[PDB]
Design an enzyme around this catalytic site. Sequence first.
Site, PDB file in Angstrom:
ATOM      1  N   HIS A  60       0.500  -1.561   0.339  1.00  0.00           N
ATOM      2  CA  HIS A  60      -0.192   0.077  -0.153  1.00  0.00           C
ATOM      3  C   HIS A  60       1.307   1.060  -0.119  1.00  0.00           C
ATOM      4  CE1 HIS A  60      -0.200  -0.647   4.648  1.00  0.00           C
ATOM      5  NE2 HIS A  60       1.012   0.537   4.505  1.00  0.00           N
ATOM      6  N   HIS A  90       6.818   7.038   5.072  1.00  0.00           N
ATOM      7  CA  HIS A  90       5.681   6.861   3.989  1.00  0.00           C
ATOM      8  C   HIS A  90       5.480   8.123   3.714  1.00  0.00           C
ATOM      9  CE1 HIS A  90       3.205   6.182   7.355  1.00  0.00           C
ATOM     10  NE2 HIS A  90       2.538   6.294   6.187  1.00  0.00           N
ATOM     11  N   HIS A  92       2.277   9.059   0.318  1.00  0.00           N
ATOM     12  CA  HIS A  92       1.031   9.256  -0.202  1.00  0.00           C
ATOM     13  C   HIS A  92       0.844  10.532  -1.390  1.00  0.00           C
ATOM     14  CE1 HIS A  92      -1.082   7.054   3.368  1.00  0.00           C
ATOM     15  NE2 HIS A  92      -0.289   7.762   4.217  1.00  0.00           N
ATOM     16  N   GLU A 102      -3.066  13.842   1.851  1.00  0.00           N
ATOM     17  CA  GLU A 102      -4.039  13.350   2.989  1.00  0.00           C
ATOM     18  C   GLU A 102      -5.150  14.320   3.747  1.00  0.00           C
ATOM     19  OE1 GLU A 102      -2.882   9.655   5.013  1.00  0.00           O
ATOM     20  OE2 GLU A 102      -4.218   8.443   3.062  1.00  0.00           O
ATOM     21  N   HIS A 115       4.509  11.552   6.144  1.00  0.00           N
ATOM     22  CA  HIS A 115       4.780  11.080   7.743  1.00  0.00           C
ATOM     23  C   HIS A 115       5.371  10.409   7.953  1.00  0.00           C
ATOM     24  CE1 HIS A 115       0.055  10.422   5.515  1.00  0.00           C
ATOM     25  NE2 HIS A 115       0.210  11.818   6.746  1.00  0.00           N
ATOM     26  N   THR A 194      -4.648   7.392   8.857  1.00  0.00           N
ATOM     27  CA  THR A 194      -4.728   7.596   7.215  1.00  0.00           C
ATOM     28  C   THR A 194      -4.938   6.075   7.003  1.00  0.00           C
ATOM     29  OG1 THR A 194      -3.151   7.390   6.672  1.00  0.00           O
ATOM     30  CG2 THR A 194      -4.482   9.753   8.011  1.00  0.00           C
TER      31      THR A 194
HETATM   32 ZN   LIG Z   1       0.703   8.318   6.509  1.00  0.00          ZN
END
Ligand SMILES: [Zn+2]
Length: 255
Positions: A60, A90, A92, A102, A115, A194
Amino acid sequence: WGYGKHNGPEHWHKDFPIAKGERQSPVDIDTHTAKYDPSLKPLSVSYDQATSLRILNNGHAFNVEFDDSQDKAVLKGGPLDGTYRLIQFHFHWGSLDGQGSEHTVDKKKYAAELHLAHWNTKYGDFGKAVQQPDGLAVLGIFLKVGSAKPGLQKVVDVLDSIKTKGKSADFTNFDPRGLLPESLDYWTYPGSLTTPPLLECVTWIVLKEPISVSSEQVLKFRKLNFNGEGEPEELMVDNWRPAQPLKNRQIKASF
Ligand SMILES: [Zn+2]
Ligand SMILES: [Hg+2]
């Protein structure tokens, strides 16, 4: 769970009922509604002594893990009470530059969001802190497309190595200080993780000032795969969760 049409964030509630909770993350940061709180202390990041171990593709996202057996890389001050240890970081990202982050700012979406996860060291281990209301500290940083980020090239280069789900690679001597913006101005609110288990244990700190990265850096993120080696290829894009209702919560500003 995933970010597909059939296993997307809109289906998580089914397996993770907390999905519909009272302190769910990410949220929209209304800058005109955020409250300037003068009782907020400056952020204190101590990452000079950080020890990176590896980079992994968990299906993911890709995680850069750190040795958290000692107070090597720590987060303190600001809205926090006590010391938080860096466990991993990591990102997103989206399919296009118009999406990826996010958290949003006055409804504005960035290209990506970084993050840095920390856990409260009075709880002794990660697994125990996720059972506490003030168990975690996530440092959020927005990524915009512009000039390259020299400090980020090293990560970019090793992605080829961890293309699919389950792959991991040695990743030592990586200094996170290279991913930080000039300013440490932030917004803070009580939220959650999240991604599933979506535990409502996080103290969010989103920096006002974004970091810029090149189009080419970001493009390499998008070549990653959700799928494991030998499976139909599903590109790793749009691994972000839609903004949740603030529901009473108040967003404080350090500036
Ligand atoms: Zn995250
Ligand atoms: Hg919790």
